[PDB]
Amino acid sequence: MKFPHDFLFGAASASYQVEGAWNEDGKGVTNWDEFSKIPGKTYNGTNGDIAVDHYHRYKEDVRLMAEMGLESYRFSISWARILPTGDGKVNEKGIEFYNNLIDECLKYGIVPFVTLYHWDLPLPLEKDGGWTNKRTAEAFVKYAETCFKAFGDRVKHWITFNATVMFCGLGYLKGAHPPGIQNDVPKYFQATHYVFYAHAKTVAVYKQLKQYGEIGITHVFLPAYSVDDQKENIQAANHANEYETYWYYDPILKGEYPSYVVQQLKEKGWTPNWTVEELEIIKQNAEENDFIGLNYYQPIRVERYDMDIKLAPGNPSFDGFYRTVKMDDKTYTKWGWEISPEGFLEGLHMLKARYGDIKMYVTENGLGDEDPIIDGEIVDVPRIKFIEAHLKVMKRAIEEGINLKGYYAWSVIDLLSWLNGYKKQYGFIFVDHNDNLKRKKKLSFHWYKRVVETRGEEL
Ligand SMILES: C[C@@]1(C(=O)O)OC[C@H]2O[C@@H](O)[C@H](O)[C@@H](O)[C@H]2O1
């Protein structure tokens, strides 16, 4: 019984990835609904139209989570289910559905942890300029307030945004996410600003509501290490960390943007169109966050741009100052992501040094795999070893006085990986695409049950 009763063992899903029912019960079209049908954007033309069909079998999937001894389920609300056009009339049929999902989790004592925005923007709001238009931030606040009024009697754990770095960075820098834009740095940075503004304003509204649950944001956590002891490389890491960690966590946690990056955007002419009022709202609401969410999969190993010659190479950074690299002496997934428990642990240390005793939830962590199948059984031993290694570093972080209060494995069920199809499995529950999307427990499902039952006595 080592992890305290204070700490939730969970597993996670995202609405676009898991629900399907893209056109049902009054749901508005989203950006991912349109974007996924552009050839070249999703793996093998893979879709969320049906996804894994969680919308129609939510009762079954929740029964399974309960059978797994799950303590908390983290899912996302589809904004286009509540408010189809982003604003305007509320779709009651969408409110019914999330009330039913919430109520079913609750039957079995499973705690909802709810993400409001997991990348699936109602389409008009894309056409307005998405997160580059303050309007979308004001719309988001209204939506959040709608969800709070409708669901907040029962839901006491809320996430505003998920992984802003990806949706903003992939949407405006690489064109791999909607709206599909490439190398527009100013829009990227502007998008992150309006998101952080929407967050802080939403947090202020939630607290004025007097609902007595908790709220915070979920970021990607992607700690950057220097590939060696070389000063140029150390500097490349510092810079990586500034842009990938500090830009995101400082505004939410500290109430100020990191002056290092601010100085460089000014020089480059890329500073966002931000107002004093917006920055005050951010500044005054940094102290209102109850927690920080971490989606952590890997660190990155960096060398400076001109230290090739100075161990395979890496992708260059957006401003071309550094690049990430792969290395002989480390372990990678089959899609090339590093598996680094020591990476994660020092990462956690770096975060307590800067942000102090902030309450941390690991809102995503897991292994993407093409699962071994034997006699119709999914024997996903690699996933078990992945989660095991990460759970052990958490156990140690806690022993070391880090304020970690939950762990949500990425993918409670097999679902759609945005850009990797169904082939990049991440779940505890298998889904049979060849047998009418039927659910089967994997090896990992039974293992995780035991971990929760024992609260992590695994040495
Ligand atoms: C990007 C991908 C993947 O499919 O590879 O990684 C894992 C996980 O990242 C999370 O940060 C996203 O919220 C979620 O949607 C997941 O999907």
Residue numbers in the entry: 1 to 310, 321 to 469
Please share excerpts from the published article on this structure.
In summary, we have characterized a novel PvGal-ase encoded by ORF1119 in Bacillus strain HMA207. The overall structure of ORF1119 was similar to those of other GH1 enzymes, which have a typical (β/α)8 barrel fold. The active site is located at the bottom of the pocket formed by loops of the barrel, a characteristic of most GH1 enzymes. The catalytic nucleophile (E374) and the catalytic acid/base (E163) residues of ORF1119 were conserved with other GH1 enzymes.
The complex crystal was prepared by co-crystallization using the catalytic acid/base residue mutant E163A and pNP-β-D-PvGal. The crystals belonged to space group P3221 and contained two protein molecules in the asymmetric unit. Part of the structure was disordered (residues 311–320 in chain A of the PvGal complex) and was not included in the final model (red dotted line in Fig. 6A). In the complex structure, clear electron density is observed for the PvGal ligand, apart from the methyl group in the pyruvate moiety of PvGal. Although the complex structure was obtained by co-crystallization with pNP-β-D-PvGal, electron density of the pNP moiety is not observed in the structure, probably due to slow hydrolysis of the substrate during crystal growth. The remaining activity of the catalytic acid/base residue mutant was considered to be enough for producing released PvGal during the long time scale of protein crystallization (typically 1–4 weeks in this study). The catalytic residues of ORF1119, E374 (nucleophile) and E163A (acid-base mutant) are in close proximity to the anomeric C1 and O1 atoms of PvGal, respectively. The O-2 and O-3 hydroxyl groups of PvGal are extensively recognized, forming one or more direct hydrogen bonds with the side chains of Q17, H118, N162 and W428. The carboxyl group of pyruvate forms hydrogen bonds with S427, K434 and Y436. W420 forms a stacking interaction with the sugar ring. In HoBGL, three different residues (E408, Y411 and F417) are located around the O-6 hydroxyl group, and the side chain conformation of K415 is different from that of K434 in ORF1119. These results indicate that the four residues in this region (S427, N430, K434 and Y436) of ORF1119 seem to be involved in binding to the pyruvate moiety in ORF1119.
